[PDB]
Amino acid sequence: AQYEDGKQYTTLEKPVAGAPQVLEFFSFFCPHCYQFEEVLHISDNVKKKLPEGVKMTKYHVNFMGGDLGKDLTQAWAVAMALGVEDKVTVPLFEGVQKTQTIRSASDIRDVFINAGIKGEEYDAAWNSFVVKSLVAQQEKAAADVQLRGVPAMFVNGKYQLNPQGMDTSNMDVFVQQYADTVKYLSEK
């Protein structure tokens, strides 16, 4: 065919019931994720081609960067709870991978303060039970698909994007191919 299992995507041996429609996993420690965010704007181009009435979900993962990786999953929970994903994503990526100025929970917090979230508001979120289960949700979704790698995208809890099987000579063509595959899978 044109789209083939094992080529632009793989199928889960054990599908996940009730999973979010488009589920993306990343780490601020993940080099391809940096690219996906900063250079390729993958999430955004997928969105642009998705049928509407479709929800997009993105979660952080623990298995990179040890202790700080976990801090980062909790901070992403804070970002989701406060609705400030779009203000912290770039400085978190660059603070971890570019300038390497994020070395502790306190430095992560600095990024939020500098993004304009108030200390009181961050620390209250950071410590809230609404942030605890949000962390729990992130871990559970990753657990459900036995996730050992990022970046990763899952469609309807059954299909997994396979970027290794797509053109990389041209970055724009890679993105469109990636986004069209998500759309195809979503209509499946």
* Residue 160, both tokens: 């997994």
Residue 141 neighbours by CB under 8 Å, 6+ apart: 19, 20, 23, 25, 57, 59
For strand 22-26 and strand 152-155, is the pairing parallel, antiparallel, or unpaired? antiparallel
**Segments forming the whole domain that contains residue 36:** 1-188
Technique employed here was X-ray
Query: Sheet harboring 159-161: ordered strands across?
Result: 9-11, 159-161, 152-155, 22-26, 56-60
Which is it for the CA torsion 169, 56, 47, 6, positive or negative? positive
Q: Which of 58, 171, 65, 79 shows the shortest CA–CA distance to 131?
A: 79
How far apart CA 6 and CA 162 sit, in angstroms, is 8
How far apart CA 69 and CA 88 sit, in angstroms, is 16
Which is it for the CA torsion 29, 120, 85, 188, positive or negative? positive
Which is it for the CA torsion 76, 157, 181, 162, positive or negative? positive
What's the CATH code of the domain at 22?
3.40.30.10
Backbone angles phi, psi at 150, to 5 degrees: -130, 155
Contact 114, 50 (CB under 8 A): no
What domain count does the chain have?
1
How far apart CA 24 and CA 80 sit, in angstroms, is 14
Residue 2 vs residues 16, 73, 161, 177, 184: alpha-carbon distances, Å: 26, 37, 15, 12, 11
For strand 159-161 and strand 56-60, is the pairing parallel, antiparallel, or unpaired? unpaired
Burial class (CB in 10 A: 0-12, 13-18, 19+), 47: middle
